[PDB]
Design a protein around this ligand. Structure first.
Ligand SMILES: Cc1ccc(Oc2nc3cc(-c4ccc(-c5ccccc5O)cc4)c(Cl)cc3[nH]2)cc1C(=O)NO
Ligand SMILES: Nc1ncnc2c1ncn2[C@@H]1O[C@H](COP(=O)(O)O)[C@@H](O)[C@H]1O
Ligand SMILES: Nc1ncnc2c1ncn2[C@@H]1O[C@H](COP(=O)(O)O)[C@@H](O)[C@H]1O
Ligand SMILES: Nc1ncnc2c1ncn2[C@@H]1O[C@H](COP(=O)(O)O)[C@@H](O)[C@H]1O
Lengths: 300, 177, 386
């Protein structure tokens, strides 16, 4: 095993579930626009989907789906997006998925965290709903951030391993090639197009020089639902990002020579899902995400 | 071990002297000590059939309220059956307890509403620095009850808090009308 | 021969319980003293408490606390059930206050801490005593409080209220003498407030020889505060003795109160692997919800209406009470049953409210979600009644 791998095999998912939490669920017959509003209303990123006909949880609705819908059916700021307004979750699931393959990926509360970290990486999803086999009820929605936050406290207790001592280039952790980025002047629609094709959680915003001046993430997109500005995707990411409430600190960055330990502290402190690796010039060399780091500690 | 099983012999009535005689003591006279109108002795008896009688102030009698047996010679004794089920507490409570309304049919004041149920867990605002999915710890009395939102845009919103072990989950369902 | 059970020789009567009598007992070898509660089996059958007795025995058996009377063993016989309990020689707190008068502030606080510690421990174990009063609080040779006589107690269930009137009028909360429903920890707290007063003043806060006057005094929440009482403890009494149960102090509130915290021993209140996991977790305009469905219409009207709508949806029901129904729906897909309770309540004179409460299933792993099936079951009915 690994030092940290032993820990993850020990603890059940129940260990992560908070004392009292809120869970939102959507009937698949629900108008898909109303659903994305609900996610905003209740302040949650994802929700399980329930089919009354099948009496089962068929799948999960996330902000990625909102991005897929916007990009597919957006035509111009002058014409409303009919499919967003008219469709139901089941209708768009049938359109989006021609294949009958994709099942709902769930985990039991008794199952260990290691098994949970595996399943997130296997299907490459960021949401794992925890379902009790006996009751049939969905208990909690597990995420990368929840899990790393848990480990971080445990990582401090255990004796410092050599991995943490080594620098990020030596460690080879993260994605250093084929980086999806956008210009300051890039339209949101084009940015959305890039989300769909690269399937990445966030796009660094770079200037003419190559330096990162900002970051545009799938989370920033949900703001379109919030302010009901989704009808106009022609605006630049820069104008769209002005709407972020938190007055902006410079983009969170890390360096190649910096230790894995240093980085995990910076990520977990800031609660952002990824870090941007850069040259002194601020030119983007790559991305380190939670999924990368957990894939390191799950295997390595 | 299972040969010693505690049995209460109680005579309800007045007397200067009360004695117990049975098969178990070879029909000797065992004096019963008194509390008010109760004379008692407690004895360990083997599982099986046992016959007994009382001697109360110079008169042989049996307890009329307890079971009796009658000999072909005309002797009238009390009889008692020692059962192993009598000596385990929960087994004996099971026997004491022994001693289909589902089909729907064609067919006072209403209890005043307990104010506990008007504490709505979702109407409670939480802090801006914490995860929005998180909630306050519920009163156990609030659990399993149904809460709802006024129907709007042809959509109904239902909610209830249920417990799983030491954890609680408040579930919201969005269903169209 | 003497009266002897489990090697203990039965002595003098200490008092009379709900069942039988409680007697002292003395070990034939060591001379150890115990308290033996005698429960006559034909008596517990007469008023059928048999299950209520079995649950009291199960619960009390597990209890281990210094300020609650311990249940050592339960011994069964053909005629009788013997409960062997710890014996404390000091007797009732009530008798103590009668003989010695009010206790000073430090002694009152010391005892009130021990008692509330016991009450809390019961509540943490989902048990409400409901008979709390100085007659039910005993004392050992060292003046440690011991809560006794759980005969009127009850276990707290999820989503359930208790209607049972209990305890002495002097120690009963306004909702209890008014016959209203209650969750029950707030009732033990009210009683504990009356006990606290008795300790400090040597008298009862609500007492009258005229019973209707006594009930009014209780529902008014008005009582006399002697000049010698610390203003600090007066505020604590005011909070514990709040008429409105929603405004009434909780055990958390009392532990935070300054008068209570003084001199407080560490052992009294609870606050390995399981503890560590909990610590980790803890370290890591708007919509307006409302309960059930309301109708300004009449109670016989709204009851008939529900039954009609239940029948329309093919559901089956039992009328357990005029205003309380148990419903069972067959699920077409899973071919299983989903049960819920309906109760009507009165919001005010002009308004009534129907309540939906899910009933936990018997079943081991089965298809679909209980919580959702519960929602769908209600949804169908609500659409009709809306
Ligand atoms: C009214 C009544 C009638 C019968 C009843 O059931 C029983 N009452 C019982 C009384 C006794 C008992 C125990 C001990 C002594 C005794 C004898 C000598 C010296 C000291 C003693 O305590 C006397 C009687 C025994 Cl061993 C078993 C008993 N079972 C209970 C009750 C009742 O509910 N009292 O509140
Ligand atoms: N637990 C899950 N089971 C099935 N599909 C999922 C699950 N989580 C996410 N998805 C889908 O995977 C895609 C990516 O979602 P995200 O996890 O937000 O990147 C979306 O189209 C979701 O509908
Ligand atoms: N902007 C990006 N360009 C290229 N790869 C990325 C980018 N963001 C994340 N990744 C990689 O995509 C995978 C999933 O990351 P995430 O979408 O952040 O969960 C990881 O291997 C990341 O290193
Ligand atoms: N590396 C970063 N630097 C600055 N802000 C970020 C970074 N990553 C995410 N954010 C912000 O965090 C929010 C979304 O976080 P997440 O969905 O966890 O990526 C958005 O407001 C982003 O602009």
């Amino acid at each position: 095993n690994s030092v940290y791998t032993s820990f993850m095999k020990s603890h059940r998912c129940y260990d992560l579930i908070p004392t009292s939490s809120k869970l939102v669920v959507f009937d698949t017959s629900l108008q898909v626009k109303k659903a994305f509003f609900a996610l905003v209303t209740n302040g949650v990123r994802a929700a399980p989907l329930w089919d009354s006909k099948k009496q089962s949880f068929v799948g999960m609705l996330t902000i990625t789906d909102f991005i897929n819908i916007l990009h597919r059916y957006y035509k111009s700021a002058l014409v409303q997006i009919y499919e967003l307004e008219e469709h139901k979750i089941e209708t768009w699931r049938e359109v989006y998925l021609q294949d009958s393959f994709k099942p709902l990926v769930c985990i039991s509360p008794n199952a260990s965290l290691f098994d949970a970290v595996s399943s997130l990486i296997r299907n490459k999803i960021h949401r794992l709903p925890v379902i009790d086999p006996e009751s049939g009820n969905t208990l909690y929605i597990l995420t990368h951030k929840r899990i790393l936050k848990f480990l971080k406290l445990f990582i401090t207790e255990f004796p410092k391993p050599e991995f943490m001592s080594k620098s990020l280039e030596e460690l080879q952790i993260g994605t250093y090639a084929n980086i999806a980025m956008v210009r300051t002047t890039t339209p949101v629609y084009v940015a959305l197009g890039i989300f769909v094709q690269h399937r990445v959680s966030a796009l660094p915003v770079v200037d003419e020089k190559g330096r990162v001046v900002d970051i545009y993430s799938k989370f920033d997109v949900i703001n379109l639902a919030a302010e009901k500005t989704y009808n106009n995707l022609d605006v630049s990411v820069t104008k769209a990002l002005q709407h972020r409430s938190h007055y902006f600190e410079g983009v969170l960055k890390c360096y190649l020579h910096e230790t894995l330990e240093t980085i995990i502290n910076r990520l977990v402190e800031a609660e952002v899902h990824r870090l941007v690796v850069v040259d002194e010039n601020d030119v983007v060399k790559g991305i380190v995400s939670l999924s990368d780091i957990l894939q390191a500690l799950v295997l390595t | 071990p299972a040969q010693a099983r505690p049995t209460v012999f109680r005579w309800t009535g007045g007397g200067k002297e009360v004695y117990l005689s049975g098969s178990f003591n070879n029909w000797s006279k065992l004096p019963l000590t008194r509390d008010h109108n109760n004379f008692v002795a407690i004895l360990d008896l083997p599982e099986g059939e046992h016959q007994y009688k009382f001697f109360v102030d110079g008169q042989w009698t049996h307890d009329p309220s307890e079971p009796i047996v009658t000999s072909q010679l005309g002797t009238v004794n009390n009889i008692i059956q020692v059962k192993k089920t009598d000596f385990e507490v929960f087994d004996a409570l099971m026997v004491d307890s022994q001693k289909h309304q589902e089909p729907y049919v064609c067919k006072r004041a209403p209890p005043i509403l307990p104010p506990h149920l008007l504490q709505v867990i979702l109407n409670k605002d939480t802090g801006i620095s914490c995860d929005p999915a998180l909630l306050p710890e519920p009163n156990h009395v609030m659990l399993n009850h149904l809460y709802a939102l006024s129907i709007k845009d042809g959509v109904m919103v239902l909610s209830a808090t249920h417990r799983y072990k030491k954890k609680y989950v408040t579930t919201l369902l969005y269903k169209p009308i | 021969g003497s009266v002897k059970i489990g090697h203990y020789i039965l002595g003098d009567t200490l008092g009379v319980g709900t069942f039988g009598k409680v007697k002292v007992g003395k070990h034939e070898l060591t001379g150890h003293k115990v308290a033996v509660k005698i429960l006559n089996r034909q008596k517990i059958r007469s008023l059928d408490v048999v299950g209520k007795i079995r649950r009291e025995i199960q619960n009390l058996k597990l209890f281990r606390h210094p300020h609650i009377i311990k249940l050592y063993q339960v011994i069964s016989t053909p005629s009788d059930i013997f409960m062997v309990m710890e014996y404390v020689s000091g007797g009732e707190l009530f008798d103590y206050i009668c003989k010695n008068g009010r206790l000073d502030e430090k002694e009152s606080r010391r005892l009130f801490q021990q008692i509330l510690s016991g009450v809390d421990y019961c509540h943490r174990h989902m048990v409400v005593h409901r008979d709390l009063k100085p007659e039910n609080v005993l004392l050992d040779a060292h003046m440690n409080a011991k809560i006794a006589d759980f005969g009127l107690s009850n276990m707290m269930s999820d989503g359930e209220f208790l209607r049972t009137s209990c305890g002495s009028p002097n120690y009963a909360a306004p909702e209890v003498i008014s016959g209203r429903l209650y969750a029950g920890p707030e009732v033990d707290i009210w009683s504990s407030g009356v006990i606290l007063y008795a300790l400090l003043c040597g008298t009862l806060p609500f007492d009258d020889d005229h019973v209707p006057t006594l009930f009014k005094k209780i529902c008014d929440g008005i009582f006399y505060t002697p000049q010698y009482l610390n203003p600090s403890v007066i505020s604590l009494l005011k909070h514990m003795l709040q008429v409105d149960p929603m405004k009434r102090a909780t055990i958390k509130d009392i532990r935070e109160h300054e008068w209570f915290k003084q001199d407080l021993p560490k052992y009294l209140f609870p606050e390995i692997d399981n503890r560590r996991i909990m610590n980790e977790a803890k370290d890591f305009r708007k919509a307006k919800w409302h309960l059930g469905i309301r109708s300004q219409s009449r109670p016989n009207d709204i009851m008939a209406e529900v039954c009609r709508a239940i029948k329309q949806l093919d559901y089956e029901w039992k009328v357990v009470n005029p205003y309380y129904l148990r419903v069972r729906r067959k699920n077409p897909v899973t071919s299983t049953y989903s049960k819920m309770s309906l109760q009507l309540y009165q919001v005010d004179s002009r308004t009534y409210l129907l309540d939906f409460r899910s009933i936990d299933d018997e079943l081991t792993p089965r298809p679909g979600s209980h919580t959702i099936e519960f929602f769908e079951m209600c949804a169908n009915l609500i659409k009709i009644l809306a």
